[PDB]
Amino acid sequence: ASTQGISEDLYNRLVEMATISQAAYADLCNIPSTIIKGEKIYNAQTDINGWILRDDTSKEIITVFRGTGSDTNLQLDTNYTLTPFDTLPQCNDCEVHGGYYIGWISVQDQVESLVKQQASQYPDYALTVTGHSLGASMAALTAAQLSATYDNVRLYTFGEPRSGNQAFASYMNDAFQVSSPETTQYFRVTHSNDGIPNLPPAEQGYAHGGVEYWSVDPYSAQNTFVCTGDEVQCCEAQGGQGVNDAHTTYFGMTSGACTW
């Protein structure tokens, strides 16, 4: 099913998380001054880049991952080999995108240690995870892992690939209350004919989870659709091919542009 239009409050949240996601490509340029920038998440071998942040005014600890900013990252993006999600073996039969798994493994210890410290200090804060493109799948794997330990994890993704198999998607749907848009804590944001949410193809054993929030132009709260279920519709019906203009530009913000 689908409905057109979301609340301004929700819309504004999506835009804020999209801003941080798109700023992650340029050392978090021009993000709100009320966000406290914490430690840089980094592995040289995978070139995974991200940060832990805190917003005391919204009572959230935010983990953001940069999408592809190097050929090293592109190697990760284009490895579609399904891999058992062995860092979270309670996810029975869960398999994930092989490239993003290699990414995740490279930064897991650092992410978990930073979140543990911050979450213990701010136990009432939401644990929000976000990213664009490769950063969106990194966010998904991270949120999955965090959700087994913490009850207040929230996930906002932009131009997210299919991050794993149906087992993985179903695990995330359960963990993030996806059965209703009224309860969901997983906001899978897509834009117009973005090609990336069609990859890897479902026929290779891949599936999306989350509630899809489909931004159609001209972007606005009124022009964002809420798409539920597993039928082909919204971004996945538009026939977008790979990296296209719709992929790079969410709520008018192009990856690394810094013109917000």
CB 109 within 8 A of CB 122: no
Q: How far apart are CA 237 and CA 256, in angstroms?
A: 28
Domain hosting 168: range is 1-260
Give the CA distances from residue 140 to residues 7, 218, 241, in Å, rounded to whole numbers and listed in that order.
24, 27, 22
Sign of CA dihedral 167, 91, 146, 149: positive
Bridge partners of residue 52, in order along the sequence:
63
179 tagged catalytic = no
> Contact, 135 vs 65, CB < 8 A?
yes
DSSP codes of every residue in 71-138: HHHHHHHT---EEE-TTSTTSTT-EEEHHHHHHHHHHHHHHHHHHHHHHHHSTTSEEEEEEETHHHHH
Binding-site positions read: 77, 80, 247
Alpha carbon distance 170, 94 (integer Å): 9
Nearest to 143 by CA among 191, 210, 201: 210
Which residues make Cβ contacts (< 8 Å) with residue 232, sequence separation at least 6? none
At what resolution in Å was this solved? Answer: 1.7
**How many angstroms from the chain centroid is the CA of residue 68?**
13
Residue of 221, 154, 234, 220 lying closest to 190 (CA atoms)? 234
Interhelix angle 134-147/166-175, rounded to 10 degrees, is 60
H or E element, residue 168: helix 166-175
Query: Alpha-carbon distance 58 to 69, whole Å?
Result: 29
CA angle at 177 for the pair 174 and 183, rounded to the nearest 5°: 170
The active-site residue, picked from 97, 132, 208, 247, is 247
3-class DSSP assignment, residue 67:
coil
Choose, from 21, 106, 133, 147, the residue flagged as catalytic. 133
**47, 191, 194, 215: which one is catalytic?**
194
Structure tokens that stand for 161 in this block: 């690939």
User: How many Å apart are CA 96 and CA 53, to the nearest integer?
Assistant: 26
By what technique were these coordinates determined?
X-ray
Exposed e or buried b per residue across 30-57, where buried means at least 16 C-beta atoms within 10 angstroms of its C-beta: ebeeebeebeebebeebbbbbbbbbbee
Residue 245 appears among annotated catalytic residues:
no
For residue 153, give the CATH number of its domain: 3.40.50.1820
Q: Which residues are annotated as a binding site for substrate?
A: 77, 80, 247
Measure Cα distances from 6 to 10, 45, 62, 153, 184 in Å. Answer: 7, 40, 23, 21, 13
Q: Describe the strand order of the beta sheet including 211-215 as a list of residue ranges.
A: 2-4, 224-227, 211-215, 186-191, 153-158, 126-132, 60-65, 48-55, 35-43
| Number of structural domains the chain divides into | 1
Contacts for 206 with CB less than 8 Å, ≥ 6 apart: 80, 82, 97, 162, 163, 164, 165, 200
Q: Is 120 a catalytic residue?
A: no
